[PDB]
Amino acid sequence: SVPTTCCFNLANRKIPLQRLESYRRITSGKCPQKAVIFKTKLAKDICADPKKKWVQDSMKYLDQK
Amino acid sequence: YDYEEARCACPARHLNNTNGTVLKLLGCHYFCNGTLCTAPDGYPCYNLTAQQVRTLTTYPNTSCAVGVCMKGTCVKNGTMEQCFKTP
């Protein structure tokens, strides 16, 4: 229930869909700010703002994958 | 794609507390892919002594000074919390 990492720098520019493997939502009010964490195919985690259209669309894409 | 613009958009391990407030960074810096990044100004942090950091684990031990990040320095604000690493 307590996130093991939090996001404090959010990627503003779109990550290409072909690089994305999965995502998780950091919604706990215990992190200083909410975020979506994308995991890439290189197994890196990238923080993004859930309020950007590209973030919501990338989540929809990964839900379909 | 601008890798340089996104170089510091990686998450970081924070410290919890038994005090019911947000998780906070240890200090004001973190690595992304082995490269140095700085937390934004105003971000919550803990300022621990050199003695304290040797025994910082996933359970509290002694009182931790709260602060805020200011140009990469965790500046204390007077509040103390019983902090510990998230697992």
Numbering used by the authors:
A (entry chain B): 4 to 68
B (entry chain A): 15 to 101
Text from the published report:
Evasins are chemokine-binding proteins from tick saliva, whose application as anti-inflammatory therapeutics will require manipulation of their chemokine target selectivity. Here we describe subclass A3 evasins, which are unique to the tick genus Amblyomma and distinguished from “classical” class A1 evasins by an additional disulfide bond near the chemokine recognition interface. The A3 evasin EVA-AAM1001 (EVA-A) bound to CC chemokines and inhibited their receptor activation. Structures of chemokine-bound EVA-A revealed a deep hydrophobic pocket, unique to A3 evasins, that interacts with the residue immediately following the CC motif of the chemokine.
To understand how class A3 evasins achieve chemokine binding and inhibition, we purified and crystallised complexes of EVA-A bound to human CCL7, CCL11, CCL16 and CCL17, and solved their structures at resolutions of 1.51–2.01 Å. All four structures display the same fold and 1:1 stoichiometry. The chemokines assume the expected compact globular tertiary structure composed of a three-stranded antiparallel β-sheet packed against an α-helix. In all four chemokine complexes described here, the N-terminus of EVA-A is in contact with the chemokine N-loop. In the EVA-A:chemokine structures, the side chain of the chemokine CC + 1 residue (Tyr in CCL7; Phe in CCL11, Leu in CCL16 and CCL17) sits in a deep hydrophobic pocket within the evasin structure, possibly enabling the ~35° rotation of the chemokine relative to its position in class A1 evasin complexes. Moreover, CCL7(Y13A) and CCL11(F11A) exhibited substantially increased affinity (~10,000 and ~200 fold, respectively), suggesting that the interactions of the aromatic CC + 1 residues in these chemokines had imposed an energetic penalty that was relieved by mutation to Ala. Thus, we conclude that the preference of EVA-A for CCL16 over CCL7 and CCL11 is because the aromatic residues in the latter two chemokines are energetically disfavoured, a phenomenon known as negative selection.
